[PDB]
């Protein structure tokens, strides 16, 4: 029905917030070479899935790791410099998160439209039978 | 993501590369017996779009 | 022998063609909204 | 037979059960910057079986330090659906009356 | 291939943890020390190195992984997850939980000491080893279990998930509850 | 029980940038 | 509801089109011995009863810009660029001649 | 009788919805030099006409392309250049285009209001008497 | 029999709003990139169907999906991308699906004032001969 | 006999596009 | 009781205003050193409650001053500098306080939905019946 | 659910939470 | 199930299996 | 509304923290036996439901 | 009419009918 | 009539002799 | 009653 | 209430008020 | 005749010490006149 | 009463008029140095009463000039120069005159739609009874 | 009135 709209663009602007707050976490940490739970910070992704389970609502099932090499820099005097003095920093995309935030905004903002047009749907077929 | 988007961020992730080939070449400027990196760019697959197959 | 042949991409070529696609794209979509704005205006015919 | 009970359906507690649920996501909407407070959601068939409640949403974020629950994109969706379906329901308990009516009076 | 000391250099941390990920490598070195966790998902690792040590937890989920020879110390967990391990060996020292799930392992060493959680789920292994001790929670869910044995330990809960128990331990204390 | 703290940037934050009082941070948990 | 709406829509997904076979010619600037692709538009009439007011266009790629690209002395000797006009035959992956 | 309304306005409704599909295939083949069979676009116009000799209804009588030059543009390099290196394309002009967008949905919409005005004249004249 | 309008209305209100909650899945699934090359999310459309052997109901025929390539972008980060880097989008194009977003409003708001309007003709008939 | 097909943008364009499906159009 | 709505929802502006003119004390107060009251000024946070326990509405229960250093900047000749030239400022984050100001503007305005959404349901309700 | 979802740990180190 | 290498929220024990992630 | 607004001011924040460990560093070239200070960044995950 | 309206070409290019 | 005005019908052309020649 | 809130009123 | 709200203050100093 | 006056926005909303208003119409505040 | 609130509202409307005037001219003559009255133009300001002892109407009661100094500036070649060589401009504050322009503009509005309101209460209950 | 009120007239 036209509700069924609602649950599915409903699921996408929580899909597409969830895109954001990586987003968001992954430019925050392109320069932390240091991380609680001893784990240099990699760059996450959020994957989208269709759960088709007519209407097939999107769904987050999981962020995932970048499979990127992590960017090593030499900095001996470091204390969290190895052996052979290199510290690695996160492999985080700038160009990427950038391309994802515009998308994720465009993505959101267009979602958003699709329940707006349901909705007048919806409201006329209630002024039928009055 | 509109296609377009896309196929200007791998010339935006070439160039990076580039770039950073172009940086380690310039640091080793006095290294003994160092020789130069240049990277080569070609481009991707091309697809028929208004053909089913 | 000794050298490299590059791409021939007329970069201001591209760009100019860029804004004029551009402008005819958003001509075009005021189309797009000027004809449901029609449409939704001849609907009251059947609203007796 | 022949008894309001009957005549009305459930229509009659559908009505106040959607008057339930658009305030609790207004008090959700109104809470979402106070830290520590917990969205609350308001189970529908309890309300039916109430008829014939006001349960914890657990998040799909984790919070950012306040504690707070509240997914301001979440509740805008269900408010403005409530509401539809709120006009539904008095459409369908008000008609109920005016067939009521018809039926009595002849006219 | 095989991986190098210049190219293990290239997949580690700041705090020392090796990433493998959809790599292409095929053997380790003899006496590997880790300093972190350890992680070869998605990897056509058929075999672990003899005397391999993790100084964290070993991440083998959805990968080639087949064999580990004994002697090798772990001190976080062990996720073969989804991998090819069809026996654990014995004198594993553990020092987190044992996740199974979805492996073509049949056998399991006898007396074996989980300090976490076991799972068995969804794998033909036919029955559990004699004085079994868990000390978190077993999930045999989906499996070919069906008879426990004489004496076994489990401190957590038990849960079924499905397949059915006909034989029950002797000798049984729990710390939890049992679900189906 | 009464649960109150201070909203917006303050609070967003983890709790080792000591903006939020001590009492007050007491405070988001519950009260009577 | 119109078949303006449709006819618009036609218009604006087809620029979509030709801004991204644009796109690939900047992507590829620094590509060496990349021919640009040429973008054009064409103007097919719908043709049946009534007055002929409908007109759709469609985006093509009608050639390429064959002229010489921007040549780089590296002063290599397994670097060769051709002189004016031509070609180099190789063969892909898939064992068919194609000219580079 | 009013219903003879009816038909001038439907007529000039179908007369305006002509020249709006005209305006929609000059805005979209602005920028072809190519065609489907072989010659080049030119701008398109509907010709409305009334039969004078009641009511006189407005018909379209057929289409007729714009007299102006083809701009030709030097594009000497391109495949369908000519022995001057030129390319013609479209004489559609932008400015004129949109003032006809906003001048039949105008014209459009109030057709509309006089034959819904005109619906209710009629109801009125049936409720006479009683 | 009595009501043959309203089944061709409501038939209509039925299959146009199943276009609309086809439109929404492919909006919101257009970035699911999912996993593998043949399990890719593909955009859905809805076949309407007339079967005529009075009143020709719509009926919708299933949902077929588009035949579209998908879109292929290159990310050798992803990792369920492939041997070459590629990851296959969904063949969702924006501009046809906000296209069939205003189509399907209008049409399904339209079938509303007929069977609005149809109701009114049975209650006059009602009135017949007082 | 019926008469089925895709309605919508995916139907109202040229058939050069090929995006209906050959056995549906 | 949708008139409680509009209780939760003006009890809701009300804390969102206040919090607003508390940013606005904050941003022209990031640069005082001196004050009537001989203290350096703090910035300012309202203490925003909930009653839970249906309706609850948010209460402002007073402003508490943030708990950071005063900066102190060497100022050895300000006249109101201590034995070591240091005079202490604000702790005044401003990045903090547009994030602030653009909370307590949308959470303003979003309030406003609700009432004016709650409102219509209100009026809905008494034509039930009539 | 019918109880409170527990706050976000947000620890300078995990070790100490 | 579907993403092979899906993160965890809960923080890291080493002896509990986290049951956040679908680890089928 | 979002919490990335937050998530990226707290990240914002910490920049302009470290800009000012950098200027303490640059005003500190002329004084006499100064050890430099080491800035970096923790990154801290919020650990729980979601 | 009593012959169904024909249907609508837009042939991409005219010589290929 | 209206003198120039277009046609809704395919162009007849040259190659073909099939169009140069049919009236 | 926030512990520690500040005043209305001229210290 | 039944008695006029006061007018705030905003003095130079807090001590001539 | 009991009225309440004085200039309206922003010279009044600034605090007292700016002194743009004139004494005599801020006078006019109190209730006075 | 609502007719009253009409006399209140609309009292506003002209009072807030008067102060958007007063603006006008203190923008317009924040840079003449000259006058036609011989006295240099000062930043005059509206005077708002309510005769408070119902419904309270808003009138100005006069315009006055503020009782800022005017601006001296160094002109000493300038033809209307003192002795000292300075000339004088009015006393008017760019920031100031920008929030009266808000203000008043918002005021302005905000009374609109309370005489707006009242009208449709007023009509509702000339239906009552029937 | 005011007493710093305004003239309309000339001076």
């Known amino acids: 029905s036209l509700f069924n709209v609602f649950n599915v663009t409903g699921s996408a602007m929580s899909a597409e917030s969830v895109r954001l707050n990586t987003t968001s976490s992954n430019l925050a940490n392109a320069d932390s070479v240091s991380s609680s739970a001893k784990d240099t910070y990699k760059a996450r992704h959020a994957v989208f899935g269709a759960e088709l389970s007519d209407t097939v609502p999107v769904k987050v099932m999981g962020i995932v790791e970048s499979d990127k090499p992590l960017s090593a820099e030499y900095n001996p005097d470091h204390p969290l410099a190895n052996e052979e003095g290199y510290i690695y920093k996160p492999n985080v995309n700038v160009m990427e998160e950038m391309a994802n935030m515009i998308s994720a905004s465009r993505a959101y903002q267009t979602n958003v439209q699709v329940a707006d047009s349901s909705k007048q749907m919806l409201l006329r077929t209630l002024q039928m039978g009055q | 993501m509109h296609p377009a988007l896309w196929v200007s961020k ?32 070609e481009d991707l697959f091309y697809q028929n779009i208004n053909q089913p197959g | 022998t000794g050298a490299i042949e590059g791409s021939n991409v007329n970069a201001v070529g591209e760009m100019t063609a860029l804004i004029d696609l551009q402008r005819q794209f958003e001509m075009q979509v005021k189309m797009m909204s000027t004809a449901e704005e029609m449409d939704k205006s001849s609907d009251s015919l059947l609203r007796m | 037979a022949i008894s309001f009970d009957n005549a009305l359906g459930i229509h009659q507690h559908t009505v106040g059960v959607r008057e339930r649920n658009a305030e609790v996501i207004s008090t959700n909407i109104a809470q979402a910057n106070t830290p520590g407070y917990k969205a609350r959601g308001l189970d529908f068939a309890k309300e039916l079986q109430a008829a014939t ?5 657990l998040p799909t974020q984790p919070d950012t330090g306040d504690g707070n629950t509240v997914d301001l994109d979440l509740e805008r969706n269900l408010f403005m659906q409530n509401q539809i379906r709120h006009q539904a329901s008095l459409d369908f308990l008000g008609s109920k009356f005016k067939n009521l009516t018809k039926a009595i009076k002849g006219e | 291939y095989e991986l190098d000391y210049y190219s ?32 070869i998902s998605q990897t056509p690792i058929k075999k672990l190195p003899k005397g391999l040590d993790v100084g964290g937890s070993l991440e083998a989920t959805n990968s080639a992984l087949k064999t580990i020879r004994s002697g090798t110390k772990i001190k976080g967990y062990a996720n073969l997850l989804g991998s090819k391990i069809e026996s654990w060996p014995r004198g594993i020292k553990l020092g987190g939980y044992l996740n199974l799930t979805d492996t073509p392992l049949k056998t399991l060493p006898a007396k074996l000491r989980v300090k976490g959680d076991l799972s068995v789920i969804r794998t033909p292994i036919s029955a559990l080893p004699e004085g079994l001790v868990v000390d978190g929670n077993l999930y045999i869910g989906g499996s070919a279990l069906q008879v426990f044995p004489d004496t076994m330990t489990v401190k957590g809960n038990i849960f079924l998930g499905g397949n059915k128990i006909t034989k029950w331990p002797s000798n049984l204390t729990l710390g939890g509850a049992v679900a189906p | 029980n009464m649960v109150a703290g201070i909203p917006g940037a303050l609070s967003n934050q983890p709790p080792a940038d000591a903006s939020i009082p001590q009492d007050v941070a007491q405070m988001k948990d519950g009260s009577v | 509801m119109d078949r303006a709406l449709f006819l618009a829509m036609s218009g604006a997904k087809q620029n979509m089109q030709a801004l991204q076979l644009r796109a690939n010619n900047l992507a590829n600037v620094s590509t060496t ?35 010489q690209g921007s040549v780089i002395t590296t002063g290599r000797d397994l670097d060769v660029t051709i002189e004016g006009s031509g070609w180099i035959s190789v063969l892909d992956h898939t064992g068919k001649e194609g000219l580079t």
């Open chain 2, 10 to 41: 791998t010339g935006l992730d070439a160039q990076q590369t580039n770039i950073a080939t172009i940086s380690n070449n310039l640091a080793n400027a006095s290294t003994v017996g160092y020789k130069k990196s240049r990277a080569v760019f």
């Open chain 4, 53 to 57: 409640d006001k349960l914890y949403r």
């Open chain 7, 33 to 67: 011995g990349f021919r640009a692709d040429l973008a054009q538009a064409r103007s097919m009439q719908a043709y049946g009863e009534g007055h002929p007011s409908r007109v759709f266009s469609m985006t093509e790629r009608p050639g390429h810009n064959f002229a």
């Open chain 5, 8 to 39: 293990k250099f290239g997949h580690t941390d700041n705090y020392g943890n090796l990433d493998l990920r959809n790599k292409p490598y095929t053997q380790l070195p003899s006496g590997f020390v880790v300093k972190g966790n350890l992680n």
